[PDB]
Amino acid sequence: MQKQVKISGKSKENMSLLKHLKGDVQGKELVIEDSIVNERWKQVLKEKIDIEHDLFNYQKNREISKVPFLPVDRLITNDEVEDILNTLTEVLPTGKFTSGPYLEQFEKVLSTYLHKRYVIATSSGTDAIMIGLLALGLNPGDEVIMPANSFSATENAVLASGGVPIYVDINPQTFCIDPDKIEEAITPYTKFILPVHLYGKHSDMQHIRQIANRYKLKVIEDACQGIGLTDLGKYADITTLSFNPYKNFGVCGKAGAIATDNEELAKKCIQFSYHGFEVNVKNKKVINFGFNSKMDNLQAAIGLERMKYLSLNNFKRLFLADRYITQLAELQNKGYIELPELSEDHVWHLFPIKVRTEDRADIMTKLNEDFGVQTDVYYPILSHMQKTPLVQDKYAGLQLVHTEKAHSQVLHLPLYPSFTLEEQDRVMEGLFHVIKQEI
Amino acid sequence: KQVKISGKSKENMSLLKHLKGDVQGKELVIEDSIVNERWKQVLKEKIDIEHDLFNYQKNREISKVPFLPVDRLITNDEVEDILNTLTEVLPTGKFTSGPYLEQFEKVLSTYLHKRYVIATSSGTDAIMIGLLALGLNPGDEVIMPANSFSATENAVLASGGVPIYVDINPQTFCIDPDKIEEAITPYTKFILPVHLYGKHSDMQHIRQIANRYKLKVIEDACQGIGLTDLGKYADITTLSFNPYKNFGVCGKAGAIATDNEELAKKCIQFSYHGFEVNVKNKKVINFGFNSKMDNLQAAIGLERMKYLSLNNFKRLFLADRYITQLAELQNKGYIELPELSEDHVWHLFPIKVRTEDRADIMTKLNEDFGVQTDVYYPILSHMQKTPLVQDKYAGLQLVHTEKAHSQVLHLPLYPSFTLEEQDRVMEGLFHVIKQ
Ligand SMILES: Cc1ncc(COP(=O)(O)O)c(CN)c1O
Ligand SMILES: Cc1ncc(COP(=O)(O)O)c(CN)c1O
Ligand SMILES: [Cl-]
Ligand SMILES: [Cl-]
Ligand SMILES: [Cl-]
């Protein structure tokens, strides 16, 4: 009796798929979930697959002299462009670019994909967080517990709506908020915990929800880099997503989403997202104010096209990350670097290794100068280290030991779905070469 | 001798006079501007406006006149320009930041005669960021009218500002400068006039008051693109490029324009996460937003902007045709018509009817003649049913605003509207009012 292998495109299921697509028999046991996110799989999976050749067109003998970290022209493929041009041919003459039926359809599709009853699509991930906090009842002075290593948009969303960030240390291996440091930071002004699934890695949400239940806190998660994570939002009151062009799934402009199972909360999000108006009643305010922060109908139509590539693209990211972890194994075994763990709760938006603090600048310089290999560090400045009057006045004396140590060690290697395996070879070879010459 | 064509409201008025036989000079000179590009394909020496710009079909069968059919606010010609530019934009993979964004800001700068332009994700965001850049702190008071779209007050409230509502001039629908000083308190920091319906507020008088009391002036010109001397007396000028404006993109966008460099710097910092200008991830102020205009929309706007001068002129022609053709209804005192003024771009066309008759007029136009009208906007700021209003604005009376609010009626007016539809609107109004 054969166990079926459900292809949802989610992170846990992709992990089994990786094993099966590596093997010789790829038959009826592989069942493609009837979803828009799986559309590009449908055609690919009609035949037996060799991953290297069929998904990556591996050309080991193609000479490579430069490896850009993130060439944006390669983040969108010719087939996506043709798809998008086709849909726009129909959307443009409708004259509906802000409100419209593609926006509504896009929200339903996300709702089904996320298993969340209500989805409110927004004009950015930053707006989603900001509106989410307000809809959850954030008042000026309310404290929000969060990590200090996220992109600046996370703290800005708290600050913009009047909140007070309270920074807490991360787990230095996962780069996510350490749930064992959270309870320490709770005061009578704490109302929120805002975990970030940094680089695509899922935070320890079950533990976080336990602390939150204990102290009656609300949980809003920044999953802007985590689309595709299995069980996303299971333990959160609000989930926020970004669809900016650099994400695992993005549109052609700024956009994001709020997702929730709570109807009263959803309604408030809608009200905040559109001028404080009663839902579907233009010009009639039912709350003090709101923003102009719904997603555009035009981007929604674009999103319905690009979403067709998501499951395949997340799978290719997983393959790339597995290949890094396996081929670089020796550098970790001998204790020169730390590799991320090949886990089910990661969608590989970014790929972090850790190197020695004292060597990082030189490792980066040598990869670039000697081998044309570009790497990067997301993000260069920690929240409590920003040179702002707020930080200077209120965040002096703060020490986050693990966060600061990890921040000095982390190095991101190129990884995106249209990256080639032969570029990756170059990255890995160069890494072996420069690390060995550090010793 | 030369009749210069800028596309701006004053020159448009002289062009109109000139083309109606009232000669203003000899040689038509089309200024070399992006906003005039499409004018060049239709504007000839012996132009017949009714035929050459409107393709007037006196006898075309009409059974409905929609107030604002959104599919007709973008032409087939625009759709093709847009598809063509997107064919080149899409493969670059640059959709947020990028070179079209920078070019679009440059082009707006030249057109508006403002040194710095910061293109934003919406007009609402432009106002919000402009207020903050100008130094709005929570509790600071902002003098403003109560008859604008809710976006204006929301931009103040979102940053914790405090709206102070003042009465309007009931003929112009704009903030009455003679009611401003009255409302000034030690907490007042800004005046925020609105060029409502596309009518220019009395900015000179407003600036005199501002200087006297050391206030800042940020104007909501989201409906006023094309006004001659827009921003001459303002510290910050805000625009919207939403698809319903005199010029719009294909999504949300707006702009802040200013001549002040330090202000511009602050606007950029607030518009993008509080980062140092052009230096990602390095904050120099406490926080910012994700509120720049998208590169993709700027590519679209660079195409749609080519139709602006032509479209604004068409709006003027329509407004002038309404005012001339409906004259009798005003002469006999049945309605009031807007004044044919150089300082208007006719985003909306407001007439005034009797308070007690407006509902019936609207119903009879629609039911008997399929003529749809509307009222922008249905609810005044101090009459919204919110907790802030009940706690802060209780008992406020704005006599002229409230009266005008009960009287105003908007007639269909947009660049692609037809003269045959307009005839139906006008004959309908005559037949309804007589009866
Ligand atoms: C962790 C994180 N949170 C929030 C955001 C903000 O998302 P958006 O750009 O759609 O505003 C980003 C975008 N880089 C992000 O990476
Ligand atoms: C007078 C006025 N002010 C501000 C705005 C807000 O502009 P946007 O829709 O681009 O946010 C509008 C849009 N209707 C407006 O009409
Ligand atoms: Cl929904
Ligand atoms: Cl730092
Ligand atoms: Cl500029």
Ligand SMILES: [Cl-]
């Ligand atoms: Cl009202």
